[PDB]
Subunit: 299 residues, 4 copies
């Protein structure tokens, strides 16, 4: 785990821009990568849940991975979410990530069909092999995957040879502490942005989050405040993040974020892919106001 | 619903054979199609959950659809499960099913990401358009999809223009009855094989099931028995189905079925795709014995 | 379990009438017992969920047990639900049921606090001992108890010395069949009225239900129809039961039932105990019409 | 809410000691009350889930309330958990709490039968009336109650006239923050001991907990450390609390706690009431060593 310590940080879960024909918008993808870099983000987690991985083909996911590396390789840390239900598909994406010079790969626990724990372990092992030396970030998100990993199961997964981190999108902060206690050196990303300050206090040492695309400096601010013992500032920042997250949950998170980025002149067309619909027009004034507030704040 | 009456019956949820390199085994696919036809099945439901849809590419799913139509079009009913999380991908499969001469299309409620009910409705409408005249079979499987659907939501879905049937993979037989009561003419497929007799009694007028690949005649026997008022034979047949299902659940259902079909000289290599593992070798004697029992019973 | 065979049948889960002050309405209880007897009911299940056991004191529950035995002992079968969270409290009620000359006792799996399976087992053993010869009816209602027993755990419970039946308030009709297959002689009561026909088909040999208080003859009609191979009549009766159940679920089931019984001149004051509120006035025309309908139909 | 500020703090959810015959062990109950006061606990939450309320009669619960008020009234804050499924039973216990001079009442959302949100509200209103001026602590524990309240529903409940606090036994720390943001003055007790530090950070201003009976000073220590900006001490203390909680979850929490207290000479017979069984003998060494560790630490 100590050999992956350079993966520690606050990493935006990159959104994948589309146009009105639902095609990849590669110009907006480049703009969003540069926007994140200019903001001072530590890294990008590419083609994850927030990236709409599960409504893209392997080819599309590869095209996005390739472009992000062109834009960002060597400037910030790059994690490729290569996870699919299929192991073989996941391996293809892992091999591509390696070719493009990503720093790490990542895979969600495969979903839909119930798999045995042993089947999960073998899935990670196979993807790790295809990653050809890129460390693996195990991605746990029980709310969407339906996969209910026990602590003992998590301990086994995060100690597989080649695993360097866990992205823990769980609100169970007892379990967060338990993981930190068992694995003192493990890179442990908090995945729910709306508990980030609490997740760090429980033992996370960074995070990966969708909302970091529009306000990642606030999460950096929380890490800094907690490091300095400035509890009030950490709380204030988390409160401001949660005010924003309340709105995004109302509007739909990915599309709300894309809409903010559109009003920030970053994303040309703020659409997610079908079956996501567009943002309800009634929310547009709040989203524009938020874009303006955040632009004023970031300066 | 009246117009889609011809879709009523007992339809096997077709397995997709693979080889040891995890490639499609097209020769075994043709053998399994013909094996199902010779059992006297009413039709096939192709590329569904049982067909390992979600570990195949669109191209692979299309190749399978095309072969099944070559082998079976005009001889038995053909329903193409075209569902993906992506609407656009689902539409491509629906257009392909139309080109190949399928009798109907079907789509699981899209999963992983939470979608609103309106979004689900639009997804079905879009697929129905691309199906270009083929009726839609709505596919409800809350246990795997994570989409619960209220009764009112089901009623709205099954009355969209172009919907001709519901595949109801739910053990809630109060809801089964409520659906029948609201929609007297709706084709209503019982989805859980281990309650088939009870599901018919509650109001299903047919079924779509994985285990029909190895013993579809038993399910047709339950239909006949209940039609004749012969309750004891219906129960006896369901009990025998359930003795089989108990075993299949222990071994893993799809791979156990493929293993039975291998011992029956239908499927060359009884593998599912990774991350499914192989059948535990400790179960092979029981599966071989089962294959021999069913071959003896069938003649 | 051939010793408990005489417990087989269709038994109403007796409601507990209260007066305007929410005290026991003894006169209405006596009238309701006689009303049930005159419908041709096989027995009464007293002080269960439907009897509002969990908002009564032990003394109150005993008073109800005593009165019902006075009114009904030797005329129909009498099952005392003695279950509490506390084992000792349950034993007190079991001892009382024995003194009053009940035919059997019953206990819900103790709830609120998680208990181990062994602890569940010891609870039933202790209550069985205090019942001093009265057979025990294990009562399984996962939806309310929160207790999620495996099939194996059910098998162990129903084979404890002194256990003569299982009241299975579960809509899992695979499990209903599994239980019947494992225990061919076990008295197995279907607990969800809205799947009664399907539950019998799966393996139940009777039922215990709240709605039997207002239309028990319909359930006896289903038993008769299925015995005679008359599937149509069984379905028609189940459908009619479910029309009523739809309404009762809208109104609140216990209070809706008590309101129907008020309009049938049995229950003086159709209130449940706080925190149950009154029936919404808007439902009274429907409940009155139902009362009139059922009275014209009769036993 | 701001008038109930006096209820803020760290309150032990008192255990109910029983004798070998499973009756109330009054001598051990008195010792446990005094033990808690000596640890510097802010108050006691009596006849809760931890007190094994739901395996006691109303009379038994009243006997406990009376004895605790005898032992503690005026020295520390006293909150009576009076909640039952029945509203009338809960009212009886609220009336008793008032007679015994408790500072507040509390009630778990009534369970087993599903009740409408309107019905929950009326249940609390009725209990508040019977408490006759004692503020109400709404008690939310979805994992045991099966009651899944929305944030809007919580907001309505905690703003009923007479409600002065929320005991929030939920691990959802987004919701904890939302509650604090909507109700800046509300007393908000963190209920899961194993996330206490994180719960305070999210917006709780105190806690009610079972493990406070054996190491309440540690929780007070977390409060102090966070107030001082001493994040490492707060984290260290939380880690130590969780090492203990890991063990108690293995042993069974209430019986494990009673066993630790037995080895501390507080509880004569460390049994919970049936259907709870005894602690597995295999855990006795660890529980005995924990008792020694904690006595040495205090």
């Amino acid at each position: 785990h100590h050999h992956a310590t350079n993966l520690r940080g606050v990493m935006a879960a990159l959104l994948t821009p589309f146009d009105q024909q639902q095609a990849l918008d590669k110009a907006s993808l480049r703009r969003l990568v540069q926007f994140n870099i200019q903001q001072g983000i530590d890294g990008l987690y590419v083609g994850g849940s927030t990236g709409e991985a599960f409504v893209q083909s392997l080819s599309e996911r590869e095209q996005v991975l390739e472009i992000v590396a062109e834009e960002a390789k060597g400037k910030i840390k790059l994690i490729a979410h290569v996870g699919c239900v299929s192991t073989a598909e996941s391996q293809q994406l892992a091999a591509s990530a390696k070719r493009y010079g990503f720093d790490a790969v990542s895979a969600v626990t495969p979903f839909y069909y119930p798999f045995s724990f042993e089947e999960h372990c073998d899935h990670y092992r196979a993807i790790i092999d295809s990653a050809d030396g890129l460390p693996m970030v195990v991605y746990n998100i029980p709310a969407l995957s339906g996969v209910k990993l026990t602590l003992d199961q998590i301990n086994t997964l995060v100690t597989l040879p080649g695993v360097g981190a866990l992205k823990q999108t769980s609100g169970d902060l007892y379990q967060m502490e338990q993981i930190r206690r068992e694995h003192p050196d493990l890179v442990l990303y908090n995945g729910y942005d709306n508990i980030f300050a609490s997740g760090l206090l429980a033992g996370a040492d960074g995070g990966i989050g969708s909302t970091y695309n529009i306000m990642g400096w606030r999460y950096q601010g929380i890490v800094k405040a907690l490091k300095e013992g400035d509890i009030q500032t950490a709380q204030k920042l988390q409160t401001e993040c949660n005010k924003v997250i309340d709105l995004l949950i109302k509007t739909g998170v990915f599309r709300g974020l894309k809409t903010v980025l559109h009003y920030m002149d970053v994303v040309s067309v703020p659409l997610c892919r079908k079956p996501f619909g567009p943002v309800d027009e009634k929310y547009l004034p709040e989203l524009k106001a938020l874009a303006q507030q955040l632009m004023q704040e970031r300066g």
